[PDB]
Paper text:
The bacterial flagellar motor is a huge bidirectional rotary nanomachine that drives rotation of the flagellum for bacterial motility. The cytoplasmic C ring of the flagellar motor functions as the switch complex for the rotational direction switching from counterclockwise to clockwise. The basal body is made up of the LP ring, MS ring, C ring, rod and export apparatus.
To obtain the C ring-containing basal body–hook complex in the CW state, we constructed the constitutively active double mutant D13K/Y106W of CheY (hereafter referred to as CheY**), which can mimic CheY-P to tightly bind to the C ring and lock the rotational direction of the motor in the CW state. The C ring-containing basal body–hook complex in the CW state was obtained by incubating the recombinant CheY** protein with the above purified basal body–hook complex in the CCW state. The density maps of the LP ring, MS ring, rod, hook, and export apparatus in the CW state were locally reconstructed to the higher resolutions ranging from 2.8 Å to 3.8 Å. Although the structures of the LP ring, MS ring, rod, hook, and export apparatus in the CW state are highly similar to those of these components in the CCW state, the protomers of the C ring in the CW state notably undergo inclination and compaction, suggesting that the binding of CheY** induces significant conformational changes of the C ring for rotational switching.
Residue numbers in the entry:
A (entry chain As): 1 to 89
B (entry chain At): 4 to 256
C (entry chain A6): 3 to 136
D (entry chain A0): 3 to 54, 62 to 78, 83 to 136
E (entry chain Ay): 37 to 245
F (entry chain Ax), G (entry chain Aw): 36 to 243
H (entry chain Av): 36 to 244
I (entry chain Au): 37 to 243
Amino acid sequence: MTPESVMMMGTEAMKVALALAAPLLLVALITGLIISILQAATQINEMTLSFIPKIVAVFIAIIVAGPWMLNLLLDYVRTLFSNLPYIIG
Amino acid sequence: VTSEQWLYWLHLYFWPLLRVLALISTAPILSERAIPKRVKLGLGIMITLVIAPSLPANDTPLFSIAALWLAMQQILIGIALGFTMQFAFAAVRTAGEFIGLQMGLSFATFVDPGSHLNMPVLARIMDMLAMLLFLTFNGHLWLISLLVDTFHTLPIGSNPVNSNAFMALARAGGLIFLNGLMLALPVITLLLTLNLALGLLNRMAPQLSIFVIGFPLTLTVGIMLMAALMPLIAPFCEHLFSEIFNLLADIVS
Amino acid sequence: DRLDAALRFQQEALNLRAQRQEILAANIANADTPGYQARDIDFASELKKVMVRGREETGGVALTLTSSHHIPAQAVSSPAVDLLYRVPDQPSLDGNTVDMDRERTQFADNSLKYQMGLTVLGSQLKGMMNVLQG
Amino acid sequence: DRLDAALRFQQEALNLRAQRQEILAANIANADTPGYQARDIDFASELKKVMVGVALTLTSSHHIPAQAVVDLLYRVPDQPSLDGNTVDMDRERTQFADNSLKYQMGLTVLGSQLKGMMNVLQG
Amino acid sequence: SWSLSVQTLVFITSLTFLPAILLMMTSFTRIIIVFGLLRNALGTPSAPPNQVLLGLALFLTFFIMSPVIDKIYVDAYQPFSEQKISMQEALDKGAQPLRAFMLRQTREADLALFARLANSGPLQGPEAVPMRILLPAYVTSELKTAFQIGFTIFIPFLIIDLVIASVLMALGMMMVPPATIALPFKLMLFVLVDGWQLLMGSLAQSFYS
Amino acid sequence: QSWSLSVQTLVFITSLTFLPAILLMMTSFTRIIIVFGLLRNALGTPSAPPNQVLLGLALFLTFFIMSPVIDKIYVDAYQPFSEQKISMQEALDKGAQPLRAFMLRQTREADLALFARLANSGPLQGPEAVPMRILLPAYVTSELKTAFQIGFTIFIPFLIIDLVIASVLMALGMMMVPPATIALPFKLMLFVLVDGWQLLMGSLAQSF
Amino acid sequence: QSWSLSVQTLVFITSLTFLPAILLMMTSFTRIIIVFGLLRNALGTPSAPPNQVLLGLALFLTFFIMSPVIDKIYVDAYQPFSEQKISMQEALDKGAQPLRAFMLRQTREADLALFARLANSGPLQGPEAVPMRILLPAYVTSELKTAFQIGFTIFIPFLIIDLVIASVLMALGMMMVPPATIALPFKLMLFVLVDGWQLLMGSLAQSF
Amino acid sequence: QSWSLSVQTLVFITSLTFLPAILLMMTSFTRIIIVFGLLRNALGTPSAPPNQVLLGLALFLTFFIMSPVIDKIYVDAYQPFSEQKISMQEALDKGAQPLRAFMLRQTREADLALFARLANSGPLQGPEAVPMRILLPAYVTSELKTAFQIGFTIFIPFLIIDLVIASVLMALGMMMVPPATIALPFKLMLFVLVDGWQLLMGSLAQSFY
Amino acid sequence: SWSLSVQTLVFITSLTFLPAILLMMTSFTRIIIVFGLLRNALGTPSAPPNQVLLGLALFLTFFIMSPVIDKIYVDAYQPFSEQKISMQEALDKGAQPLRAFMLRQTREADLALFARLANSGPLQGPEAVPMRILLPAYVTSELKTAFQIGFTIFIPFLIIDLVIASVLMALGMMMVPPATIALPFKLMLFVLVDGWQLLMGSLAQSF
Amino acid sequence: AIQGIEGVISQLQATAMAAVSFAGQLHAALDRISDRQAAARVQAEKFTLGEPGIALNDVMADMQKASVSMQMGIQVRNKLVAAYQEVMSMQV
Amino acid sequence: AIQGIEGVISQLQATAMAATVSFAGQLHAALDRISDRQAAARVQAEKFTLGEPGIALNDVMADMQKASVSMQMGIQVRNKLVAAYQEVMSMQV
Amino acid sequence: AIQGIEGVISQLQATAMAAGIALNDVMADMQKASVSMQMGIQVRNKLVAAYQEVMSMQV
């Protein structure tokens, strides 16, 4: 009820969002950086060949860590809906 | 006996109802479409039932241009109060949308302005957070109390009016921008530095950077930055509400 | 103001019809009382008079009731109409001029004219709800 | 039912008036019977008695429900007849006319009450 | 007591205000506001059709207001029907359990504000609060509680859209709408975590707590 | 014991007011209409088939699905009531049985358990002890959940097409094009080459 | 057997109530309306022709297409009824046949089989005896499928134009130039030059 | 032969409902608003003047365009109606002729031929004998085609500006600069200096002649 | 003076056209278009909500109509009570200040075009322009004025965007999009100079 | 209640320091109409009882007046309900 | 029934242990009250037409009018309830 | 009032510059009040509809 509780609500929610999005974004960033440094080493420059492995890497990311995200988000929503009638004002 | 003078009761219960309902239809949270219309009408009716008997009853007939002037006055007062209150949420929405646009979340606006493709999701997040904070600080009760109080300052009866006062509400349009800049400032600046950092990377081997490495990094950095910046809005939320409230108190009179 | 002024003529005519019928009923009630001159009012002149200057009463004063336990009481009250005497038709030994044919003809005529006033006023009020309704 | 309590008094008065009407007409019809005593009822006392029962209990469907199933005062004679008949024409004719009038009045009152209860509901 | 005609007239007239009692004196407002907000959240403004949500809200309100209705019936309707309590006293007797139910769920701040707006004297205990103060205080408290519940409801459905947009933006697909992708995932979430049982139980507890 | 004919007429003509409510809450109309709206959202165009056509088609589908229940009601309640062999109340009680069975067969256990918890129900026992006022909201909740389960998996192929087209377009280089604009004709092609309408009706019917 | 006059006018007014449903689910209005909406979406102009203009055009096209069926109904059914030659029941039965034939001409056998199998209808010998309750949903489904086919096919030339302009812009290095702004005037020019409106209406009429 | 007063009132009030349909399918309005719907797209601002401003401006322009037709209808048909020298049926027959001529002069022959063939009409001796059922949809079709022609022609100078600005931006190596935002103010410049609105309305009015 | 019921009918009917009066007769279109163009200038099409812009334009319109409202009050509101003039002579007398304002804000070319569109040859004087010719001409003049003000607003933001892009290109960066960098600088320039208050002051001065 | 009497003395102290409604009017009108009807009914029952002094003229006139008062109450209720329905129909 | 007697003994056990309003039940009770009032008046008219002694015409008419008043009560309550339900169900969430 | 007499003299300066209850009454005032209330409701509805049409704009 108190504004401290509200702002905590937003923080924990958006940290959950950060945890959900961090693996995919970080995998894409690492793949892009690796392809870019390889291009710099080989002196190859086409703006389209960096887009190819990124999709494959990010799609594999759901294969490997997808169940973890799905279990984390469901637990968050379940706990939020269960604690809903105790943060009422 | 068995009089029950109806015109007296109607004139006593009408104009306060007009002002209360005019505030209701525009005041934030009390004007959200999710409330059924009958609930809003009943709240206005009950508030008027509580308030009106204490006020001096007016005797101007409903079939006169004076009644039209009175109705216009009540509508103006109600919409002015509600809109001045709404300005703070407008400012919060502006700050959130700008943080989100510096995230690169909606890049299609820079190339196709107003092209039916825009999602200010951060703006919505902080808008609903601001609504929750406003609910916590009981701002709506204050709004109702000030709606009641503006009578003593400005009675139902037609009273003369001023000018630059309207400018004040219009000049409040500056606040939406001015306060929005500060909220952002605590994050956009660092994001700016990040973009500057990306520039240093592009000053190296040409191409092979930006649109491939900049976007995910800046998205994650914006996310964690403003996630850490979330505790900061609440003092600024109270500052915004106080600014709107004392501006209203000073200018309505 | 405008609506009050537009409906004021027929309303006042209907009130005067009611008072005239009260007077005629009083004449009919006292039809066998010895020494009672029949009373009646000139409807048109009194209607114009009430039109120009608002309705007034002889007395109609009453005890004031500031508290909630004061006993309410009102003294005699009557309209400000001029009660004129009807010309008798034929003499009578008891000494009343209430001729029953005249009384019952005026009663029926006043009845129909009051119903006419009700019809006109109701038509006007519907003629207005028709506009307002939407 | 509350509706019965409102209309109980007038219904009982109407029924008592009908019964006393029958008794008075029986007195008129038997005027010539030698040895016949003129009988009547005291309307007020009997109305008190009627205004001032246990349906047997039905356990199932086959069980049969309970099956349902005034005091006459002699008139004081006025003239002594030789055949023992105490019926007086004038007294009972006046009583008969009065009872007819009161029966009509009771019908009027009961109809007015029912019509009021109706116009309350109509709409 | 009143005549039977007057009692019938009053009963028929009072039968008119049933929607007003349902909306301004009952648990209906919070449930309907929460349902509207949730429908706004999932991105399907016409999904459970208004009639389906209205029927569900009516059944929920009937299940929630059961003890109050029972107390009214045992204390007011039963003596009135048995000609033990007059018609003008059954209303006063039955307005008390509803008043108590409205009080418990109301808030001090609203009560203080509407005690000040009426220029009434000090209210040392809750037993001195009339209905003219409790009615709008209860209404405002219910509105605020419903909006709080809906606004904490809204957060996950916007979180999903945020992460969807960020993931789409990582790969450079800047011209893909995020709402169209997020809607099936929001439906999947609301299916997985017992979307309705948890919400139903949370609302019911929110009343009985 | 039987009601008077005036009472029967009053009750019969009053009950017709709940016909839309019965059709929506108690029958298969809700699930079909929700699935159709979700499919319209998934097609990429929000109002291609007018609401009127979808509503009529959903009504016909609901009638065809519920025809066995209607036949059972007619055999059990309508026919023996119209021949003046049973009373109105007993006819309604007898006719509530096949509809109760239909509602139970599609009811989630958790929904029924929760709504029995909220109604203070204690020793329930046989599946034939659930009252109508408890069974109905549980059926509505189960129908909403099932409709959402169907919709979110109806969404899948169109998301696949959208993602494939966007990925191909951006990887090829044309990143300034709107992928949805090019994708909509392909969504229509997929829907017409699979026989999406016929297969969707088959799936909706076989969901019961 | 002939209905009394009051029953006849009750039936007439109740049937007049169902007019939009008959127009949408028994005539060619739905297919034309769907194709018009898809075409409007295809030009990149979501609100250029107002809805009322397109609705009026679809209504007039439907009237012209259904003129032979209306003439058959008038000559065979309505005219004898208006001259008191036949009753209302047999007039309606005779008027059903031409409309039924028209709807059967434009339905797909697979959808008819689906709705027959779903409704548990017994084997039906030939098209002569197919209930209207079976034919109407099948005809609606076939109309939906045909409308989607026509719209998807229509979507092709504008897709060609968009792709060619996007490629021309991209091969010049113009990386941040959106192709919609350049494509919309050329879409309008293409539709104007081929006499698009009259050609598309003629194609819709010829398909019926 | 004249209709009764009740039937005349019924027909008049019933025909009053078709006012938007008559305005769209029989007057100039369809060509105007559609062009506006495209012009706001050419300027790069879909917001543009508000929708109601454009609609009312189109309404005023339509009234000015149909002033001669309205005057001819008022003189030939409605004046004898008010002065009792004609019936309602004859007035309806006579007043439509100037409007039919106005519709025919802007009707392309191909569309008219298409709708004849589609109605299986017999050999029409001359324009004067063309049925309204054939003239109405053909007029609407020709109206749509003409509006699209005008809109595409309007789309030209703004395309010129966009192409020039994009070429200038790319020739300087400023490849990452979106030219739409830069070229929008110059489109506003072009519409202001040339007096775009007045010129466009004059062109539309002259086009109808 | 005609019937009271007809007066009520006419009054409630004329109440419907209130958005038409606000848009076509007052200046509301000008402020709303200026706000839309300014929002398009900063690069954020949803930063202030449409509701807030509409309300700000409404308040600005109320102030800038306050002199005309006062003239209406003097010529129509007051004498309608003293009954020196009423009904006809007054409604038109009260509308006269609107005519003066719209003549002031209307260009001559639009009026000339709309006159030759109505074959009104003998329109010689400038205070007897009919409403049918005055209204659409006034609306077109307002559109032109709003577009000019929008371009004037556009100039500094376009300059800032161009400067940012030029410095990015000169510094060696060829891939960094200049919009992301230039957006916060656009905002800090807009706030620091206090763009909003001067904009409203100029709009009030713009009449 | 003991606390209720405490509250009464508190309100008396409030009055010391300091030194009807539409629903009330409607309740008063209903009570007046019901009292008139009950008086007419009681007089009618007394006349039917046979008690001396009660005249049929007065009974019939009082029943007439009671009927008129009931009809007045019915009309007031009808209008009042119509006005309430009109107010609740207002769109906010 | 055997199961019916099982249910009887179960309800007896319930009474032993013991030693809930219903709107549908209340409506059923009210409809029963109206229907038995009408049936009682009808049967009284039946017996009075058949000529059975003990039945009075005024009682017949009074009972018929009482039944009419009861049915009007029911009709008005039906109207109010249906109007309230329709207005509640015509609302949008 | 003293201020009331001030207002009277002000209006004089302005002139210088310029140079029991029956059913009949109960029902009539009852109807007049109903009419005035309906008029107020309709006028407010028109004003609210105009305001919502203005605010539902698109800028």
